[PDB]
Design a binder for these strands. Structure first.
Ligand SMILES: [Mg+2]
Ligand SMILES: [Mg+2]
Lengths: 1180, 117, 117
RNA sequence: AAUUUCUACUAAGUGUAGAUCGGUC
């Protein structure tokens, strides 16, 4: 027995098989003469125009609803907003009132004025033909009659626009949370600027020219906000803020140009208005067009370079503006503003925690892990680091405003250098003589320009807080919002050009074929038989798709049974899936009152309903036996599949005449000259019609048929010639050349036409064992004495690393995953992906175009992680143990590993998706683990943020302090040995118990108490015995290898001190010079360095600890690096995966304490103190 | 008929030149297609008449990335070369070997190809 | 200076011709090098330029034995061919394939060299 | 350098080893 035997057919999972259909016989001739693929290509060509027309009718519907709507609760939202909130949950009625605004306006959408003929078929049958009065467009809409299925994704997308969801695509979030807030801000800025301008410039000129209907001031009140709910109110209102052409060449200015015109005190002293956002509904095809967008967007005269001039002018007056309120958002970029002004990544964090311990921490520091946690979330919560607050966080003579000013002017100087090198590209007469996918230096110029401007975009968008803040400086933020959206436009130009250049030379554009039927192959051979007009034939080991014709559909089902030769066995025996809503319609077209009273949600009346369902039926095949499991048995035994014969020359004559179309279902695994192991979907489609399939994998309705054209031409074919040697690429392959009797063409499958067939299937439609997975995993891990754990590590000199440990903590197996062993006919060939990836990075280093290289590296890593998914599934099937993949959520960063964060997110997603239904390909599909009885040991995928702490047979562990720790004793470096001062150097030395020299071992014994050190709460033993054993590689990258005891003898014989006495600590504290303490703290820091690596050449890499165990022997990984079965970790990465695996062993140790009904609530999240206790005690 | 021999003689000279480049391209294709993908030499690539006997290493339009995947042109039976991996689609048809990495390059590595094996 | 371009232009034309024959000799050496000693064609041997696009089938100095033992001429790296077996010593370096057994030969045998295997 | 499609290939000669769904934006 094992644990995985109790995890079959728990829930349902749907899949979509993909295949290739090729024409058989004269069917391509009948398709070419009857002209069937000319009605479907033009239909898929005219889809965009009908999308434009439905967008036009939707825009007219928005401009017909929102005009005649007045509001009531708006004044209470405006008046109570700016009250400088007085939280006793009085502003909560403002929030629930804002919900009443959303339900008010989308109640005005959903409630009346049609809305029921808006997302259905009649919108292209009745309304839009009468609406867009034009034959041309009306002829298009009438040429989409009957095919009202290609718009359902369009209709499901456009129905989410008229709702209450507070998303950026919704309209209520656009009018309320985007327009009303700047409307209130413009009312307050208007009340600050409120004075007589010149008493003609607003009330006489602008009113008479612009509108001539009412006054100006009433725009800054409450109810007239309703007037700006249309699009023309936004156009008039922004025309008064920005400017308007006056339908002449007059070109009148606005209010912000009057604020520029006022010229008061050489600062302009006043805020500027913000223009409102618009409504929701307001070249990548050639080479000369993309460069023309690069002409008209990014040149020396457009809005983008002018906005860089205005943002550059804004940071030259960055001193005159008051820094009280200029907010920097807490995020990643705040670390950068600590690094490029102050010393390191964590400087402002130390000064803010110095403010935090100034209040909440007393004398005799009791700093635990939870106080650091509340301090950490308290740092996470603020979001409002102003510049005066950072000015108080500085030392003497360090102006943050001046250093920030000179460095941002340094960055726009870098932008002027890139614009200095880019003059000759868009000057006057550039004719691009290559292709744009070939002319590498031009791409290099555009790449460098878009990367400098987009990096300046991120470093400048660090200055946007959360919003809804206190009295933030509107004299700075008035200019800084007017110029930023242009830089969002260069974000879209970057995404367009990068999505142009990295295109593959072929294409996958296709269009759905209907064959003159808007009912085409919906189900599979029901009693309809002339609307679906498609079925599946089989012959030998080839599969066929039979498609009838509208002239001879019904009269084609006259074919004889068992002939003397040539029997196309056709499918029959259709399905009624989930027949429960079909069930009482037969019975209800004593027990009648039981059903109509609804008391069934009972036992005796249920049994009378069993005999009532058996008695009142006996062309159907039923077998009957609370109500829920019995209808589970109805849906269980409502399925049957069998075949019926036919004749061959009859349907061949039907092909030759034109009364029938046949395509071949065929892929590479259905070939005759194919001898290896097939794909998995081939086993699904072959076990879809197999004899001992009781209903595990069954068909589903909705199969589609596509048709892909040819994108490569015959002019550009390339091919390895026949009967000549060509070299192999795998250097672990004992052959070096090969010679074939035939040609091998490059991209052969994209030079012709292809029929495509998408067939949906459904797996375990009728579950039998329904139970909660997580609690049953915890019960089975509780009642097992000897579990096993797989520890999976992201690695530094590896890619992944595998350490499998047992229930007690002994390493069962440890190996790397740099190279994959392929198996065929007993032959095994390795493939090394680490050297492969090193060659790809070596090609990336010299390419002058790193746009195509990064995409090849990402695709390579996707193929690699699919291979690793196979290896992990074989390890889980072997030792039968849970996984311990490090929880990729704790925020922990490293920046030295090869497998980055996004690729490892995709890896964990692929483990969840593969362990939904896990199949052993080389096994019997009737036994366990096969193709029909696959294991279901992981729940579905919800999000990347739901990856936390448990998913079936998978445990997420917050990797903390697992890399740099001794696996033998449990020692971890908790000190801080950076040389900063001489007083804390003496206190460092005063904290040491007794620094003595043993001559018999020639060692510098540092026996030492921790209790005079800070932040040592996590430790357990508190009394450690350090030494100076071995040697350490001092990294700096000069690679200076350093021995320990000769360096302390080199420092103690120097400066005139001794080392032959006992208790030399005080004599070490009798010095006065600086360099002795500096180099001594340096030797202490290199003495505590546990991971020793070159980080250049891969000669040596090891792991040594200064602490002796309870036997006297030190730990050095080089003693275990060359052994056949090491009991301890062999290098730095087996340490990490080993420790993570012992964390899972800790949680399995926590399951044995609680009770059988309390296992659901047992907390898994280990702290630091408990892991250091378990690592320092539970070894031996 | 005086300046007619200017264009006729220049047509003949450019014909003998492009046949020299075709012959050197054919022999160089065979020697490079013998090499096992890691002894290949760094290669100056182009899609124009390249001359190995009159090559001027002064234009800024030259690189030096390592060639691979020697194969045939199917319809014209010409030789094509890939200048990176296969999945970069930079197929070129006029190559010349040069000793060295990008930009600052050395010579042209004449008759030193067979010695790479 | 009038009749100097007679021998200059004829020298350039004969240079382009002998380079065409050298390129066809390199290709033909590659395909006949690929043939496994039994699909070898009947072939015309020569030690002179033999211009297959202007071959005149009237001279009585042409014979049609079956070629074998393709190998190198490694001091100048040229193709050389044996007209019979190894122990006959009639090594030639300009061959043109032909249809038919000796004393008459039909036309060209173009593009059917790869078709023989 | 061949593929329903992707990644590495050549793996015993029209293929070899794994992964693989949806219709979307
Ligand atoms: Mg296979
Ligand atoms: Mg490939």
């Amino acid at each position: 027995m094992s644990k995985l035997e109790k995890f079959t057919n728990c829930y349902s999972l749907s899949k979509t098989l993909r295949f290739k259909a090729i024409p058989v016989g004269k069917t391509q001739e009948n398709i070419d003469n009857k002209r069937l693929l000319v009605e479907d290509e033009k239909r898929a060509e005219d889809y965009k125009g009908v999308k434009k027309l439905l967008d036009r009718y939707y825009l007219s519907f928005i401009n017909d609803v929102l005009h005649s709507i007045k509001l009531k609760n708006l004044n209470n939202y405006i008046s109570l907003f700016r009250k400088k909130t007085r939280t006793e949950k009085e502003n909560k009625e403002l929030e629930n009132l804002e919900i009443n605004l959303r339900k008010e306006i989308a109640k005005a959408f959903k409630g009346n004025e049609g809305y029921k003929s808006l997302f259905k078929k009649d919108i292209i049958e009745t309304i839009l033909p009468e609406f867009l009065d034009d034959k041309d467009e009306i002829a298009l809409v009438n040429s989409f009659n009957g095919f009202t299925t290609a718009f359902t994704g369009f209709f499901d997308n456009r129905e989410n626009m008229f709702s209450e969801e507070a998303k950026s695509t919704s309209i209520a979030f656009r009018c309320i949370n985007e327009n009303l807030t700047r409307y209130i801000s413009n009312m307050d800025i208007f009340e600050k600027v409120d004075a007589i301008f010149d008493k003609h410039e607003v009330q006489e000129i602008k009113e008479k020219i612009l509108n001539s209907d009412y006054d100006v001031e009433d725009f800054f009140e409450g109810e007239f906000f309703n007037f700006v709910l249309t699009q023309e109110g936004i156009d008039v209102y922004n025309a008064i803020i920005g400017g308007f052409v006056t339908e002449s060449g007059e070109k009148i200015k606005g209010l912000n140009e009057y604020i520029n015109l006022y010229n008061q005190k050489t600062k302009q002293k006043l805020p500027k208005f913000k223009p409102l956002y618009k409504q929701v509904l307001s070249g990548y095809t050639s080479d000369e067009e993309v460069l023309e967008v690069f002409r008209n967007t990014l040149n020396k005269n457009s809005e983008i370079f002018s906005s860089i001039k205005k943002l550059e002018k804004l940071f030259k007056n960055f001193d005159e503006y008051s820094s009280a309120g200029i907010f920097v958002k807490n995020g990643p970029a705040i670390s950068t503003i600590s690094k490029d002004i102050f010393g390191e990544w964590n400087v402002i964090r130390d000064k803010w925690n110095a403010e935090y311990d100034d209040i909440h921490l007393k004398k005799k520091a009791v700093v635990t892990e939870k106080y650091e946690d509340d301090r950490r979330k308290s740092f996470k919560k603020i979001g409002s680091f102003s510049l005066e607050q950072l000015q108080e966080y500085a030392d003497a003579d360090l102006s943050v405003v001046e250093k920030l000013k000179e460095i941002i002017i340094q960055k726009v100087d870098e932008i002027y250098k890139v614009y200095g090198s880019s003059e000759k590209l868009f000057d006057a007469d550039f004719v691009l003589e290559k292709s744009l996918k070939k002319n590498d230096a031009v791409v290099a110029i555009m790449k460098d320009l878009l990367d400098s401007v987009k990096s300046f975009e991120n470093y400048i968008k660090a200055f946007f807080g959360e919003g809804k803040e206190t009295n933030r400086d509107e004299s700075f933020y008035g200019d800084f919002v007017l110029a930023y959206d242009i830089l969002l436009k260069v974000d879209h130009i970057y995404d367009a050009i990068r999505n142009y250049v990295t295109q593959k030379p072929y294409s996958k554009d296709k269009f759905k074929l209907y064959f003159q039927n808007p009912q085409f192959m919906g189900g599979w051979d029901k009693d309809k038989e002339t609307d679906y007009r498609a079925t599946i034939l089989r012959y030998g080991s080839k599969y066929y798709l039979a498609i009838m014709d509208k002239k001879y559909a019904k009269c084609l089902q006259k074919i004889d049974k068992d002939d003397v030769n040539g029997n196309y066995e056709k499918i029959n025996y259709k399905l009624l899936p989930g027949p429960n809503k079909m069930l009482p319609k037969v019975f209800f077209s004593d027990i009648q009152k039981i059903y109509k009273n609804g008391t069934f949600k009972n036992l005796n009346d249920c049994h009378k309903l069993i005999d009532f369902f058996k008695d009142s039926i006996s062309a159907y095949d039923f077998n009957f036996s609370d109500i829920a499991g019995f209808y589970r048995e109805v849906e269980e035994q409502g399925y049957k599949v069998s075949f019926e014969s036919a004749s061959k020359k009859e349907v061949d004559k039907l092909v030759e005449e034109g009364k029938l179309y046949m395509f071949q279902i065929y892929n590479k695994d259905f070939s005759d000259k194919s001898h290896g192991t097939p794909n998995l979907h081939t086993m699904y489609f072959k076990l879809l019609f197999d004899e001992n399939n009781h209903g595990q994998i069954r068909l589903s309705g909705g199969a589609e048929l596509f048709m892909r054209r040819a994108s490569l031409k015959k002019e550009e074919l390339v091919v390895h010639p026949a009967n000549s040697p060509i070299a192999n690429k795998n250097p672990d392959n004992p052959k070096k050349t090969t010679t074939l009797s035939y040609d091998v063409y490059k991209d052969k499958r994209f030079s012709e036409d292809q029929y495509e067939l998408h067939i949906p299937i459904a797996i375990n439609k009728c579950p039998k064992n329904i139970f909660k997975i997580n609690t049953e995993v915890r019960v089975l891990l509780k009642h097992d004495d000897n579990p096993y754990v797989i520890g999976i590590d992201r690695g530094e000199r590896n890619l992944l690393y595998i350490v499998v440990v047992d229930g007690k903590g002994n390493i069962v197996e440890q190996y790397s995953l740099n190279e994959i062993i392929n198996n065929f006919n007993g032959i095994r060939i390795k493939t090394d992906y680490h050297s492969l990836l090193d060659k790809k990075e070596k090609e990336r280093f010299e390419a002058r175009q790193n746009w195509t290289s990064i995409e090849n590296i990402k695709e390579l890593k996707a193929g690699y992680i699919s291979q690793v998914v196979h290896k992990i599934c074989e390890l889980v099937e072997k030792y039968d143990a849970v996984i311990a993949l490090e929880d990729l959520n704790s925020g922990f960063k490293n920046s030295r590993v090869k497998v980055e964060k996004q690729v490892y997110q995709k890896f964990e997603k692929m483990l969840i998706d593969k362990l939904n239904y896990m199949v052993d390909k080389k096994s019997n599909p009737c036994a366990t683990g096969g193709a029909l009885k696959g294991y279901q040991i992981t729940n579905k995928f919800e999000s990347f943020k739901s990856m936390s702490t448990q998913n079936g047979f998978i445990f997420y562990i917050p990797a903390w302090l697992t890399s740099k720790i001794d696996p033998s004793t449990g020692f971890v470096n908790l000190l801080k040995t950076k040389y900063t001062s001489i007083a804390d150097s003496k206190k460092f030395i005063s904290s040491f118990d007794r620094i003595m020299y043993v001559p018999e071992e020639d060692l510098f014994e540092f026996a030492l108490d921790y209790k005079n050190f800070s932040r040592t709460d996590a430790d357990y033993i508190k009394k450690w015995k350090l030494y100076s054993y071995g040697n350490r590689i001092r990294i700096f990258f000069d690679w200076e290898e350093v021995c320990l005891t000769s360096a302390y003898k080199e420092l103690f014989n120097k400066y005139g001190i001794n080392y032959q006495q006992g208790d030399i600590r005080a004599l070490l504290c009798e010095q006065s010079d600086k360099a002795f303490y500096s180099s001594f703290m340096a030797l202490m820091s290199l003495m505590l360095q546990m991971r020793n690596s070159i980080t250049g050449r891969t000669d040596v890499d090891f792991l040594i600890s200064p602490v002796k165990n309870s036997d006297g022997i030190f730990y050095d990984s080089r003693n275990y690096e060359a052994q056949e079965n090491a009991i301890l970790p062999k290098n730095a990465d087996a340490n990490g995966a080993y420790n993570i695996a012992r964390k899972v062993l800790w949680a399995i140790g926590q399951f044995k304490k609680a009770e059988d009904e309390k296992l659901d609530k047992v907390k898994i999240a280990i702290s630091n103190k408990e892991w250091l206790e378990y690592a320092q005690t539970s070894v031996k | 008929h005086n300046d007619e021999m200017y264009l006729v003689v220049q047509a003949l000279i450019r014909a003998c030149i492009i046949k020299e480049i075709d012959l050197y391209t054919e022999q160089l294709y065979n020697i490079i297609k013998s090499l096992p993908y890691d002894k290949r030499p760094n290669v100056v690539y182009s899609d124009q008449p390249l001359d190995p006997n009159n090559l001027d290493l002064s234009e800024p339009e030259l690189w030096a990335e390592q060639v691979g995947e020697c194969m045939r042109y199917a319809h014209n039976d010409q030789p094509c070369f890939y200048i990176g991996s296969t999945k970069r689609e930079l197929r070129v048809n006029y190559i010349v070997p040069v000793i060295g990495v990008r930009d600052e390059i050395e010579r042209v590595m004449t008759l030193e190809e067979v010695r790479n094996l």
